[PDB]
Amino acid sequence: AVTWTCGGLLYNQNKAESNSHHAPLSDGKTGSSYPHWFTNGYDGDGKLPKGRTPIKFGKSDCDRPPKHSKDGNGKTDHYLLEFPTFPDGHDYKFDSKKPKENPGPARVIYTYPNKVFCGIIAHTKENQGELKLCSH
């Protein structure tokens, strides 16, 4: 339950997951948008294309190939999905399209269905460059 950080703001693992626990399990199906499928570098099903580098977490679940399709959460599509988890601990208005609050550079990335929390990703290179996992 350590505090995850992605060079900017903090992210209590409990909120990183809990903030998402509320988030409706689905590939982008919320009033706002988030959560959504996180290709992680993949195209949709097949592994990453010749020339790419996904985010390493340490789990063989998130590392595995996703099973996304034209639906989002069809059968057991173990597609990775991210979610903007703020530190404030406020349940982001991800379900309310309008109004919509600003997102975050850090999001909780977990495999489906079982939210196999892998960690939080964000661009800790400057402001918005490459994507990487936080450092807990």
Q: Which single residue is written with the structure tokens 């060079």?
A: 7
Which entry of 123, 126, 130, 136 is annotated as an active-site residue? 123
The rounded distance, in Å, linking the Cα atoms of 17 and 131 is: 20
| Nearest to 62, CA basis, from 133, 136, 135 | 133
Which entry of 82, 90, 130, 136 is annotated as an active-site residue? 82
Q: Euclidean distance between the first and final Cα of the chain, in Å?
A: 10
Q: Which single residue is written with the structure tokens 């109004």?
A: 99
* 126 has catalytic annotation: no
* 82 has catalytic annotation: yes
The residues facing 15 across adjacent strands are none
For residue 31, count other CB atoms closer than 10 A to its CB.
13
Q: What CATH class is the domain 1-136?
A: alpha beta
- Cis preceding-peptide flag for 35 (omega within 30 of 0): yes
Q: What are phi and psi of 77, to 5 degrees?
A: -30, 100
Cβ proximity of 4 and 10 under 8 Å: yes
Token pair for 85: 């988890």
* 123 has catalytic annotation: yes
